[PDB]
Design a protein around this ligand. Sequence first.
Ligand SMILES: O[C@@H]1[C@@H](O)[C@H](O[C@@H]2CO[C@@H](O[C@@H]3CO[C@@H](O[C@@H]4CO[C@H](F)[C@H](O)[C@H]4O)[C@H](O)[C@H]3O)[C@H](O)[C@H]2O)OC[C@H]1O
Ligand SMILES: O[C@@H]1[C@@H](O)[C@H](O[C@@H]2CO[C@H](F)[C@H](O)[C@H]2O)OC[C@H]1O
Ligand SMILES: [Cl-]
Ligand SMILES: [Cl-]
Ligand SMILES: [Zn+2]
Ligand SMILES: [Zn+2]
Ligand SMILES: [Zn+2]
Ligand SMILES: [Zn+2]
Ligand SMILES: [Zn+2]
Ligand SMILES: [Zn+2]
Length: 375
Amino acid sequence: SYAKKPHISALNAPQLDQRYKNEFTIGAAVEPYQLQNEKDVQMLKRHFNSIVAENVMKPISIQPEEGKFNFEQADRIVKFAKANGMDIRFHTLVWHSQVPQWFFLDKEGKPMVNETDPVKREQNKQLLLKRLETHIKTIVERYKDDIKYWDVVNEVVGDDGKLRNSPWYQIAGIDYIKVAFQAARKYGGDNIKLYMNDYNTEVEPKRTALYNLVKQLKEEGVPIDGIGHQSHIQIGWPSEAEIEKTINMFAALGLDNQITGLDVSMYGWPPRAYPTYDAIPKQKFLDQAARYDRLFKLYEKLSDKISNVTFWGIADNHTWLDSRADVYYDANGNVVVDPNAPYAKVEKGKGKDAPFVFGPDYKVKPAYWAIIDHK
Ligand SMILES: O[C@@H]1[C@@H](O)[C@H](O[C@@H]2CO[C@@H](O[C@@H]3CO[C@@H](O[C@@H]4CO[C@H](F)[C@H](O)[C@H]4O)[C@H](O)[C@H]3O)[C@H](O)[C@H]2O)OC[C@H]1O
Ligand SMILES: O[C@@H]1[C@@H](O)[C@H](O[C@@H]2CO[C@H](F)[C@H](O)[C@H]2O)OC[C@H]1O
Ligand SMILES: [Cl-]
Ligand SMILES: [Cl-]
Ligand SMILES: [Zn+2]
Ligand SMILES: [Zn+2]
Ligand SMILES: [Zn+2]
Ligand SMILES: [Zn+2]
Ligand SMILES: [Zn+2]
Ligand SMILES: [Zn+2]
């Protein structure tokens, strides 16, 4: 948008949450250590009114051994949010990653997926579903009065448009999804909001598979209030028109929509990253700002269907996208960023992405000015 506008400190800038406070909340994903960091704390107080745990509320973080519950890190995030009037999202009750393996072992310690006896398979389904309910019950009984929004399940639809064939699904079938939502509603009451969260919600055949799944579950009386759109997107993909079609499609079923992990990568897929932040050309920041301009204009257009937009991080000095920031080198040792160009070797996850509206020195980017204005 406006590259003339200055690279001032974000702690001096107009508040992002206040700009959008009638359209949707503005959230950030955080780690407990960031609440010990003065700049991060100042950023959260100044610009955000919603919060989510990047990692410490995932299944392996909460119950890494059966009966061993570690709420100490999650509590710190809940405490900070309460002290600053922030909404809280719980990420996440059910997932196929960062999930403890003990869930999926039979009574003799052997993987349930290997069982061939159909009578024992059914016993394993019931054992897994009981473990599921106990995990959800313990968490929700603790946090039901503090956490309004819940990622009940994460990434349960595969990119091929079939249900993801995770151990959850191989062992228990579709019922693990139904049990997760029923348990959350039972122990949390009617006032918490239950979400199905996923990436590439805009992309077929996954989009229609997600649509049909939640449609059928609601018809069977499974409580589900909304869809979480992770929105791990690029400067040019997916198109705004497909984002709009996706949001409207789910709103037509009576579901809320939340943007739950927004980042706008500088790269494509698979990414060919620059090795450092300093190496990223200025022009990339301007392409990103125009994309952010279009994207938030669309979010505002649809504000009656979106209750929250959460970024998967605070500022560019910390983003999980760096773990995807592969750097390609040609035979002369020069960096290759052209996605079809020749190259000799790749250094996986050693580069730098730049996905937010706040730079790594906590100063506002062109993308910030692009979304703080009313043009
Ligand atoms: O663990 C998950 C992790 O898997 C997830 O990563 C996503 C995996 O799917 C990727 O989807 C591809 C994105 O790029 C598209 O191609 C674009 C087409 O349009 C333009 F040409 C553009 O330049 C292209 O890049 C592919 O068709 C998609 O399949 C996503 O990018 C990943 O984010 O992230 C969440 C983790 O929890
Ligand atoms: O620190 C990393 C963390 O940020 C990442 O979180 C996932 C990002 O992709 C989606 F949004 C998932 O739902 C998030 O849970 O997980 C890996 C971890 O190392
Ligand atoms: Cl990370
Ligand atoms: Cl900078
Ligand atoms: Zn505020
Ligand atoms: Zn540097
Ligand atoms: Zn709204
Ligand atoms: Zn992180
Ligand atoms: Zn700077
Ligand atoms: Zn704008």
